[PDB]
Structure formats: structure tokens, C-alpha cells
Amino acid sequence: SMSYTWTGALITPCAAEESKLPINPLSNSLLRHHNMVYATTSRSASLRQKKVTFDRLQVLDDHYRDVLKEMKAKASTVKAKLLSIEEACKLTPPHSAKSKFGYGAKDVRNLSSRAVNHIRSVWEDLLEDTETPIDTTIMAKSEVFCVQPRKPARLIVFPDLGVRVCEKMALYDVVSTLPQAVMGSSYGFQYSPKQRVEFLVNTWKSKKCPMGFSYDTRCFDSTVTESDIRVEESIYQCCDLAPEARQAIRSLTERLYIGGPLTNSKGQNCGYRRCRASGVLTTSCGNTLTCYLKATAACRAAKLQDCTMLVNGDDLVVICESAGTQEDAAALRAFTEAMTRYSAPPGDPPQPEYDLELITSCSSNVSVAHDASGKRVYYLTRDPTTPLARAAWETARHTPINSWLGNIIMYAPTLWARMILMTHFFSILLAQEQLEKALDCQIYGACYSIEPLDLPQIIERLHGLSAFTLHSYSPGEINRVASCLRKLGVPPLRTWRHRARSVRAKLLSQGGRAATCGRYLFNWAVRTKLKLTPIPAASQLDLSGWFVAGYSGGDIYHS
Numbered sequence: 001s002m003s004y005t006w007t008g009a010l011i012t013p014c015a016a017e018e019s020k021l022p023i024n025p026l027s028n029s030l031l032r033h034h035n036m037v038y039a040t041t042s043r044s045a046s047l048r049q050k051k052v053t054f055d056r057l058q059v060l061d062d063h064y065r066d067v068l069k070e071m072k073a074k075a076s077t078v079k080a081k082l083l084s085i086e087e088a089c090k091l092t093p094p095h096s097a098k099s100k101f102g103y104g105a106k107d108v109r110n111l112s113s114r115a116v117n118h119i120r121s122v123w124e125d126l127l128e129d130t131e132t133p134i135d136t137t138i139m140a141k142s143e144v145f146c147v148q149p150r151k152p153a154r155l156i157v158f159p160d161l162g163v164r165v166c167e168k169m170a171l172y173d174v175v176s177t178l179p180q181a182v183m184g185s186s187y188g189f190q191y192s193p194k195q196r197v198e199f200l201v202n203t204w205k206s207k208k209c210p211m212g213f214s215y216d217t218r219c220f221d222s223t224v225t226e227s228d229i230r231v232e233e234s235i236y237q238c239c240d241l242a243p244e245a246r247q248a249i250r251s252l253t254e255r256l257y258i259g260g261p262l263t264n265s266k267g268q269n270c271g272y273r274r275c276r277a278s279g280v281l282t283t284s285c286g287n288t289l290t291c292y293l294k295a296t297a298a299c300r301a302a303k304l305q306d307c308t309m310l311v312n313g314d315d316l317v318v319i320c321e322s323a324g325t326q327e328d329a330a331a332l333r334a335f336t337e338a339m340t341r342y343s344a345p346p347g348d349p350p351q352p353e354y355d356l357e358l359i360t361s362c363s364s365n366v367s368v369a370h371d372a373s374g375k376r377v378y379y380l381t382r383d384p385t386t387p388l389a390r391a392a393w394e395t396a397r398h399t400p401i402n403s404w405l406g407n408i409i410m411y412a413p414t415l416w417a418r419m420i421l422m423t424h425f426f427s428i429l430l431a432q433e434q435l436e437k438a439l440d441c442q443i444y445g446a447c448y449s450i451e452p453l454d455l456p457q458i459i460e461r462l463h464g465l466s467a468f469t470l471h472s473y474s475p476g477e478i479n480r481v482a483s484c485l486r487k488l489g490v491p492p493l494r495t496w497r498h499r500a501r502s503v504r505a506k507l508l509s510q511g512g513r514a515a516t517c518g519r520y521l522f523n524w525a526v527r528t529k530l531k532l533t534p535i536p537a538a539s540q541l542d543l544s545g546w547f548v549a550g551y552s553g554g555d556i557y558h559s
């Protein structure tokens with residue numbers, strides 16, 4: 001069937017939309033070519049619609065069915081708990097889109113009488129009505145990028161706040177435990193960046209002669225069929241569930257997940273969806289399961305040997321045993337055809353790789369540097385272009401989420417995050433006297449509130465002390481950063497070192513946590529290094545909930 005149908009009504013913005021980076025005194029010291037930075041708007045919605053709208057082709061076979069049964073068997077061991085309205089409410093972000101029924105996030109989080117009562121009515125309605133397609137709102141997403149040698153906005157589809165809290169009640173525990181019980185070490189969201197690298201390296205070393213590749217599905221959400229979503233529910237149904245949760249899941253599947261009506265910001269009927277909605281609780285879990293299912297089966301059809309998958313939603317990387325150059329290239333092409341038949345056609349044609357550092361997955365790749373002792377150390381990095389453009393934008397405007405803080409946390413060991421992000425943002429926080437202020441950021445889609453002054457601890461626990469002493473990065477990494485700085489108009493190393501040494505001094509003089517930030521975060525800037533010993537607060541961190549599952553589009557907040 002058609003992934004989408006359109007009435008003709010436009011996808012409209014609910015307020016004015018900014019497209020250009022404002023000429024700001026502070027963002028200009030980070031990035032000069034401000035005209036290269038842009039944010040998508042609804043004005044490009046039509047271009048996106050045309051790309052995601054098409055009829056799907058799907059042919060299932062024995063390999064698919066065999067893998068599905070293997071996955072259901074493992075799912076059979078799980079027992080999902082069912083959240084109370086109180087717990088579900090507490091999982092709602094403060095800035096979550098308000099309900100059209102007289103209440104918003106604040107009320108939801110505060111358990112206000114009107115919020116709670118309506119949520120109860122929406123839940124009871126899910127137990128009673130098993131058919132009526134639930135209404136969803138479709139919007140053009142606003143994201144920042146750097147012009148390339150422009151991307152049309154993505155389309156987000158999400159139900160009302162009331163429905164979202166109900167999704168949590170019935171499926172939060174399921175989407176938080178089942179992916180792991182089903183896919184095991186292959187479920188990528190259970191890993192911290194350091195652990196992801198460890199998994200990729202150990203998997204790479206376990207092969208006699210390794211071969212790996214990333215597989216890019218052309219617009220994955222629209223390739224997801226009604227059949228895929230029902231198969232996905234069949235997996236959830238293997239869980240031991242409370243009757244109400246079992247019915248809720250059944251109803252949510254038929255009324256929301258498999259598709260439904262689309263309404264724009266103006267309240268106009270835009271069309272109908274028969275594919276994956278990006279803004280519902282099961283999107284991350286659902287896509288991971290579906291991508292893994294189709295991929296594991298594709299590998300068997302393609303005769304690839306010793307396949308090890310690493311899946312994060314629609315993002316896939318496969319590492320297997322090489323059977324020779326010619327054969328690998330043929331088996332890969334066979335894989336792509338199997339995937340195409342399963343309704344997961346490629347966007348960028350896949351290419352076999354024999355060098356781990358050259359494999360990009362989750363927009364990232366493994367690279368090597370060295371610690372003070374001189375020992376090689378692997379870490380996760382990525383092209384800094386987007387992180388920097390976004391860091392520029394978040395510097396000129398106020399944003400609910402601070403991607404820069406998230407990029408610092410996940411990419412602490414990288415040369416670009418240390419030299420540029422840390423220096424730029426710490427110097428700004430000092431000048432404004434806001435180092436104490438906690439800011440929000442996302443990790444695997446979940447929203448978190450983090451105190452800048454705790455970064456040293458966080459970084460030590462997640463990456464180890466080596467993150468503060470790495471040097472001698474690979475020629476490959478060095479070149480990518482260099483050319484990026486030239487393109488975006490970012491000041492050279494020498495300038496950042498000067499700013500860094502200045503920020504460092506002002507931080508040390510303050511003592512306390514600030515001095516710790518100065519000692520660890522900026523040890524790369526001074527010649528007279530300081531002894532970097534284990535930070536006390538580091539060994540007392542509860543960073544477990546940080547890497548359990550994916551929640552992008554899930555409207556999830558962890559307090």
C-alpha cells in the first residue's frame with residue numbers, strides 16, 4: 001500500500017520558523033561562515049513528502065519466518081510490568097507538546113486533576129475501542145545542518161499528550177527490556193560510546209579476516225509496512241502482560257502504530273499514514289527489531305558467513321567473515337536484494353570495508369589516539385560539521401535541548417569536542433556566570449538534566465581518564481577535522497589553545513568543581529601538565545539508566 005496519501009492541505013508551522021543563523025557576537029567567534037548554517041522549515045515539506053510517499057513492495061520468505069520465530073522465542077522469556085499513571089506522568093518532559101484537551105506537560109508532571117482524569121479516559125477508551133484510528137499531528141521538523149557541495153525537513157507524526165502518557169503506561173517497560181532480551185549484544189542502545197567501540201573492536205578482532213559494512217535504508221520509517229508493525233506486536237505479545245496492557249498494546253497497534261489520519265497545525269486533514277510514525281513510543285524499539293529481523297534474515301539469504309549485527313533503530317552495521325574480495329561484493333549485493341524484497345531498499349548503495357575506521361554507523365566511526373603513557377586507545381568520533389553548526393545555532397538562540405552538551409558527553413575523547421566545544425561553551429558560561437545552572441540534553445533520545453560542572457566526573461566514568469590526555473590522533477581523523485574547520489570558518493588550533501589556557505586559568509582561580517573542570521578538561525592546552533588522578537565523585541555515579549534503550553521520538557524524560 002501507499003506509505004502516505006495526501007488531501008492537498010499543506011503541512012503548516014505552528015509559529016514563525018527561523019532558517020538562518022543570526023549574526024551573533026558569540027557565535028561568530030566559533031564559526032565565521034554563518035551563511036552556511038541553516039535550519040529546516042515547513043517550506044521544504046513538499047520536497048520531503050514526495051520522497052517518503054510511495055507504494056511498498058514486500059515478499060517474505062522462510063529465512064524471514066525462521067528468524068521471526070527465533071526472536072519470538074527469546075521474547076517469550078520477558079515479563080513487562082505496566083506503569084501507573086504517576087510513573088508514566090513522571091516520564092514526560094517539561095517541554096512536551098501540550099494536550100488539545102486543556103492541559104500541558106507541567107500539569108501532567110504535577111498530576112493535576114484535569115490531566116490525570118483525561119489520561120484515565122484515554123486509557124479506558126483504549127481498552128474499549130479496538131478500531132478507531134487515533135488522530136496524529138504532522139509537522140515539519142526544525143533541524144540544523146551545514147550546506148553541502150540543502151536537506152528538506154523531516155516529517156514528525158505524533159499523537160496527543162494524553163495518548164503519549166498511555167503509551168508509556170502500556171509499553172515503557174516493554175520497549176526498555178525486550179530489545180535486549182531479543183537481540184542481545186546486537187542491541188546497540190545498551191552501550192555507552194566506549195562500550196560501543198569495545199563491541200565493534202572485539203567483534204572485528206574475532207574474525208579470521210574481517211569485512212564489514214553499514215547499510216543505509218532509504219527513508220526507513222516509510223518502508224515499514226502494516227505487516228511489519230503487526231509482526232512487531234506479535235513479538236511484544238509474547239511477553240507476560242497484564243490484561244489491560246495486552247489490550248492497550250492490541251488497540252494501540254491497530255489505532256495508532258499501523259497508521260492513521262494526519263492533521264496539520266491548523267487542524268486540517270492532511271492525509272493518511274500507513275507506515276511508521278516517528279513520534280510514538282515504539283518507534284525506536286520497533287525500528288530496531290524490524291531492521292534486525294530483516295537484516296539477520298537477509299544475511300542468511302545472501303550466504304554471508306559469521307554475521308554480527310549492531311542495530312540502533314534504523315541504523316545498521318554488519319561485521320562478518322570475509323570470503324574474498326569478489327565474493328564479498330557479490331554476497332553484499334545479494335544481501336541488498338534480500339533486504340529490498342523485505343521492503344528495506346537501500347539509499348546509499350552499501351560497500352564492503354576492510355578497515356574498521358572507515359565504517360560509519362550512527363553517523364560515527366571508531367578511531368585511534370594515544371594516552372600519556374603512549375598506549376593506543378580506541379574511541380568513538382564522527383565528522384564534526386553538524387555538531388559544530390548546531391553548536392553555533394545553540395549559541396545564537398535559546399533551545400530546549402543543548403546538542404552541544406550531549407556532543408561533549410558522548411564525544412569527550414575527540415579532538416574537536418575538547419579543543420572547540422569545551423573551550424567555547426565553558427568560556428561563555430564563565431562570562432555569563434552560569435556554570436552552576438543545569439541544562440537539558442538528549443542521550444539516545446531520552447532527555448536529561450545535566451550540570452556542566454559535573455562533566456569531569458561524567459567523562460571519567462564513561463570514557464576513562466585517558467579522555468583527558470589523548471594525543472596523536474590518526475592522520476585520517478586529523479584531516480577530517482582540519483578540512484571541516486576550513487569549510488565552516490572555524491578558528492585554527494592556535495586560537496583555541498589560547499582561549500583554552502585563558503578559560504583554564506579563570507576556572508582554576510574559582511576552586512571547587514570549576515577548578516576540577518579546569519584541571520581535567522583543559523590539560524591538553526598547557527605544556528606543564530598536572531597529575532590527573534581519579535575524581536572521587538566519579539566512582540559515585542549512577543550512569544546506568546543512561547544506556548539501556550533508545551527513545552528518539554518517544555517523548556521520554558529521565559529525572
Ligand SMILES: O=C(O)c1cc(Oc2ccccc2)ccc1NS(=O)(=O)c1ccc(Br)cc1F
Nearest residue numbers: 414415418419470471472473478481482493524
Ligand atoms: O595530538 C595531536 O594529534 C595533534 C593534532 C593536531 O592536528 C590538528 C590540526 C588541525 C586542527 C586541530 C588539530 C595538532 C596538534 C596535536 N598535538 S597537541 O597540540 O598536543 C593537542 C592539541 C589539542 C588536543 Br584536544 C590534544 C593534543 F594532544
Ligand SMILES: [Mg+2]
Nearest residue numbers: 216217218219
Ligand atoms: Mg536511512
